[PDB]
Structure formats: C-alpha cells, structure tokens
Amino acid sequence: TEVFVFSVDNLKANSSGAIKFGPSLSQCPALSDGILKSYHRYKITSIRVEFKSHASANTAGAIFIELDTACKQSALGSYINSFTISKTASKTFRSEAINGKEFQESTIDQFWMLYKANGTTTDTAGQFIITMSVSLMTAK
Amino acid sequence: TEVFVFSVDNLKANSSGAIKFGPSLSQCPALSDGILKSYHRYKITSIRVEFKSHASANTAGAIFIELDTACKQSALGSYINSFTISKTASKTFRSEAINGKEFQESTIDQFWMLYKANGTTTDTAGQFIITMSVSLMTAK
Amino acid sequence: FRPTGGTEVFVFSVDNLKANSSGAIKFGPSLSQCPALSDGILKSYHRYKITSIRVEFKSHASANTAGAIFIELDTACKQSALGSYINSFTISKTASKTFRSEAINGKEFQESTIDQFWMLYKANGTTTDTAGQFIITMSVSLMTAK
Amino acid sequence: FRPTGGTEVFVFSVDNLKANSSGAIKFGPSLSQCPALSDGILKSYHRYKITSIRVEFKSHASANTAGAIFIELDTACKQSALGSYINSFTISKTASKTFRSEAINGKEFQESTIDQFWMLYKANGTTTDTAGQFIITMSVSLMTAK
Amino acid sequence: TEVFVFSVDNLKANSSGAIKFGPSLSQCPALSDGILKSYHRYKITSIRVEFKSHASANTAGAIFIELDTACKQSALGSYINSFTISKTASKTFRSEAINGKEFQESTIDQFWMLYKANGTTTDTAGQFIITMSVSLMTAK
Amino acid sequence: TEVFVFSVDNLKANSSGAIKFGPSLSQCPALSDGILKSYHRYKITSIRVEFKSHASANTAGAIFIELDTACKQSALGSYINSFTISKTASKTFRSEAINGKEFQESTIDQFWMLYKANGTTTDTAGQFIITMSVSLMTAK
C-alpha cells in the first residue's frame, strides 16, 4: 500500500475534463507507467483532491467535481460538489464512493473524476493537488 | 439505507413478465424517478416478495419466480420457486442471491425478477407486495 | 469430487404437467430434466448408480380437476405405455413417493453411457388443465474418473 | 445439490506437459480440462465462484531435464504471454502452490457464462522432453438453479 | 476362491496397451486357458498391480493405469493414476472399481486395465506384477 | 516504507553482471520508473536475495555475489559469498552492508550487487528472487 501525490495543472476558468484513474492516469506516471506495470491487481482506497486557487479575487465561477465509477460519462451533469475558483478547498472521497472496496486488474480503470469550471473567461483558476492511497497485490 | 415497499398489481392467472430492479424499476418511482436521481452508487441489500392471492379457490396454477442477475434473460426457464395462485405466501431473497454485495452505478440495473403464472385462464391471481432494502452512496 | 468417485444429491423438476400428461423420465445420460447429471457429472465419471429417488407431486391445480397421475418404475428401460395403476398421486393434492435402491435397480454401478431405469407417468385426466409438477430428489454415487 | 446452490470440490489434471509447454488454463465455462464443471454443473446454475485452487506439479521427468515451469494468475481473462517469473515449479521436483480467494478473484459470485481467471504457465525449458502434469483441486460455490 | 500372480513383462518407456482380464487374459494362462475352462461363472474380487521399475534413474516418464469395465475403450484418456517409471509402487483395486461384485460367465471379460507409458524413448521401464483374487462358481 | 519483490531472470551458468539498485534498477520498474519518481529521498533498508536453481544436477559451478556500495566496480573480484548452481539458497544483507543507514536522493544509486557464475557451459542455472525493503522521504 502506497500514497501518491500528483497535480492537475494549468487549470483555467473554463476548463473541463476527466481525470481517469488507473492505467490511463497520465497525471501521475508513477502509477500509470510505473507501479501498475509491476502488479496485477490494485485498488485506490481513498483520494483527497485539493483545489489551490491561483486566481485573482475578481474571477467568478466554481469548478465542479463528479465521480464516475462507470468510466464512461463524458459531460458533467451534477453540480452539488464545487470548489469556488477564488478559494482553496479540499474534498476527500472514501472507498465506497470511488469504487475502492475490491481489487481489479491493472489494465482497467477504476473511476473518473470529471470537472467543469463553468466560468466565462479563460483566466487562471488554480490547480488540483490530488493525494491517492493505492493498495497492490499479485506482482507481475 | 432505506426501505421501499411497492406493488406489482393486476396480476392475472397467465401473467408473465420481468420486474427489472434499478433505474428501470417503474413499479416504484420513489427509487426509479426518485432517490436514484440523487446518488451515484446503490445496492439493493435484500428483497421480500409477497404474493397476496386475490383469487377464487377454483383457479389452478402457480406463478413462478426466477432471479436474473445478468439483466438479460427474457423467458423464465426454471420452475423451482413458486407461489400457488390460491394462497398467500412470501419469498425472501438475501444479498448474494440478488447481486447485492457490491455497489453499482445508478444508471445500470442490478437484477431482474422474472415471473410466469402458467395457468390457463385470464382470471385474477393477485398481486406482489415487494419490500426492498437499498443502500445509497456518493450523492449527485 | 475425488477421482475415485463421490456421492451427491441432485434436485430437479419435471414441469408444466397437465391433467392428461403421460411420459417417461429416463434416468441416466438421457435424463434431460437435470443437465447437471446428463450433460454434467456423468461426463466426468465412468460408473454410476442412483441410490434412491424421492419424487414429489406439487399439485398446482384447482380443486375441481379430477384425475390421478400414475407412476411406474421400468428398470428394463424399454416399456412405453404405463400398464400398472397401483402408485398414484391425486392431481389435487401434494404428495411424495420415495423409492429405494432395489426398486430402482440401484444396488450395482453401471456405465455412464447406459440408463438405469425409467419412471413412467400417466395423468389419467380428461381435460388439458394444469396438474402440477414433480420435484425429484435423487442420490447418485460415482465411481472411476473420466 | 439444493436449488439455492451448493459448494463442491473438483479434482482435474492438466496432462502431457512437456519441458517447453506454455498455455493458459481458463477457469470457468471454458475450463475444458474438467468437463464436470465446464459441460457439467455450470449448466445447472446461474452464479458461481471458485473459492480456492490448489495446483500441484507432479514431475514425471528425468533428473537431467533443466527448466522451471512458471505460473501466473490472470483475473482479467485477457493476458496471452506470461510476463512474470516469481512463481515457479522446478521441472524435476513435485511441488504444490495454493491460491486463496482474493488472489483468484474468488470473493464474489459471477454468472456461469463468463470466466473467472486464467492460470498461465510457461515451461522455460530447451527440449521437448516430458516434464509432468498438474493436479488441480478447486473449490467452487454455486448460487441460483438453472 | 483362488489367487493368481502373473506378470506383464518387457515394459518399455513408451509402451501402451490393455490387460484384458477374463478369458482373454493371455498373461496368465492358468486363468485364461486354465481354471476358467472348468467353471461356468467367475468374478475377480480384487487386483493388486505392482510396477517394479527395472529402469535407470535418467529415464523420464510415468506409466498411467485406467480401468475399463465396459471392455471396449481403446485409447487411455485419464491421467490420474500413475506409476513413475523410475520408482517401484503398487496400486490396489477393490471389487466395485473392477466390476467385481457379481459373477459372470467365463466366456466374457470383466474389465480391462489400460496403460500408457508417455515417455519419449524406447528404454526399459519395468514390469507389472499383478495379484488377482478370483472366485469360481458352477463347475463345467 | 514498502517492500518490493522482483526477479533477475534467465540466469545461465556463465552469467555475470551487476544489479544496480536505485533509479537504474531496471529489474523492478515499480522502484525505478515508479515510486522513486514520486519522492526525493530514499534508502534501501535490507535486501534478501534468493537463488532458485532451475538447473540439472550435472551442472557444475557456483554463482558469486559481491556488494559494491561505491557504484563503480565492474569485474567481480571476491569469491566468499556463493550460491551453488544446483541448490536453492538465500543470502540476506542488512543496512550497514548495503549502505542503507542514511537517505540519499532518488537520482543516485545506492549500491550494486555484482554476480559471476563461473561455470563452463551456457546451461540454465536459475533465477534470483530479490526482496528489498525501501524507506521513502519528502514527496515530489
């Protein structure tokens, strides 16, 4: 069981995307092109996503976070979880939320974290600092 | 975790069908068009199906129940579980039978409950009173 | 399942039994009502014997259906029509008949290619109304892996 | 075999294992080395899980054959070549490896149409001489009659 | 009831065959052209087959034993029972395994014992020393 | 602090080489292209090297092991530590032997493990199964 800290950078005020955890998690090559190449099964036990807000106080908007444990949803949809663009905050997601109770093979993803900024301008918003706890088993 | 009680009504003596639990479970809109719209992950922990038998004593036949956790079987096939049309009874199904050990997303079904009455006439048989226990996860 | 063989219990059902249904339930490799024995464990053993069977009539019928379905054991595996009328389930009642080893030719092993016995049944009813179903519980013993 | 399901133990063998043999033993409905599971009891149940397996290498080889056959679990049911070389039986020695439920994806039931895991093996030997055989002892649990 | 001890000789490292017990059991003429000519009914109660392993330690392989009480199987098929070519061992088979519960006429066989060596070379493997217990009935 | 198990494979009877622990430790990408990309400082606390001996009994020779905490020695030199090619064995090396008392940066190696088989033929000898215990510091 290890802990990885990585960052989603250059996050504008109209940035939308998906952070696809697993072997397609290119923002942390220590997991993607790293330790998942040396194990069969893994599970991500909990993640702690932090918005750091490198923005001016006049930028309006709130970036939205939504968990997709189907690994297929493209557009966001839900607007309950939100970081305000002008404030640092952090959201912590446990195992049953992120499909983290059972191991799965290192070839398939576990969940996606979709985000949508929903601001008007392309001004800078900040970055995510994501701290995930993975468990591994059956070396390869 | 909450408990829903719904009914499958107007059940004739030759009625066959599938009660598709999950988002396509139209017999309980409090789950289908309801609380599953406000959560990502769910599991149905146990169901208690009851046959109520609003039938005369001269109606012959026995309605058959079969669990499909593949969510694809159309015709019934198995004839072990059965309610007699002229008698009230109840069958209780736990978690490992109904694929209820793990959470899954609110977009996909969990299991189906197929039923086939296998009587001759179109006379009234009764109704199902189904009591399901669901557990909900990450909100949406 | 040890390779020398084992003893297990199968529960299967003969379904959709009308009030004029007649037939034979041919136990062994031609016992299509339990594929776990027919297309199943008999493909993985040479010799078998069915030690005892417990046939149950479940009677999914109305009280106005007259008749009585008759049961007859054929350990020759060749009789087509019924003939004997001693053993009977009433169509409107649940009952069960249990048959031990010497009745069903179940004392000795035989190869998994040949049947052991047949269970003939004949409804003896006028209408094609529903009668019920059989729930059959057989105890098999297996010998020599294949 | 209750219609709600049961737990049984199957013993089968992977035979004629040379000193350069590689392959995959695909557990589930495609597990042709045990027809009692493949064309057998999985035809009479919806859901199953293989709780634990005990693979044994029996080493019908001379003492001059060099090499070590390698074992690797694939619970994705898609890996073709071996890759990992940690688990190994020496070709000239009898041994056994036992794999529990969380290693072989054996915690949850799944439908009898899909496989559960594969066991890949690769001899890692020069010649085509005889190495031995696997004697595999798996414990399955069954759920929902079909 | 008497006991016969006979031998299957000159057993190479790729030898396969069937030892057909009964009147066609040519490896023991005391049963084949012997006491079965003087009785109608017989049964072989138990057999004890022994592999004696007149082989060098460098011969690889294992000869396989399989009982055929149908008296028709030609190729081997099963690989559970085995003698290692470089070791002496013995397997004992009781009555229900070898179809030895009931008498049968002296004109028909009772069972076959198939063996297949499954080694590469034609080097010497050993011999079988088989000890069978027969029971005889009505004289002839 | 985590434990890595990796293997040095395809080890012939005349194989010589160096297993260079640290960022150049290509036999375990979970350390090399893995967790060392996500931390500044590391130390390998102890290693347990095991020779597994996939060899025939007629292969002569003994593979030799020598620790180089200078990370510069090319040829072997010392012949005290040895695995016999025809036997499984294991050698365990603690912290002061492998330069494992102090942290160092993830860009530089810690020690090398040189091995030289010193047999005549190119026949198969076996493999190493190496179990190392690393400690990680400041994240990166």
From TrEMBL, chains C, D:
The terms describing its cellular component in GO are: viral capsid
Molecular-function GO terms, alphabetical: structural molecule activity
Where is this chain's protein located in or outside the cell? Virion
Q: Which UniProt keywords apply?
A: Capsid protein, Virion
Name the predominant localization: virion
- Can you say what this protein is called? Coat protein
Q: Which organism is it from?
A: Barley yellow dwarf virus
Lineage at the top is: Viruses, Riboviria, Orthornavirae, Kitrinoviricota, Tolucaviricetes
Q: Which residues of the full protein are shown?
A: 55 to 200 of 200
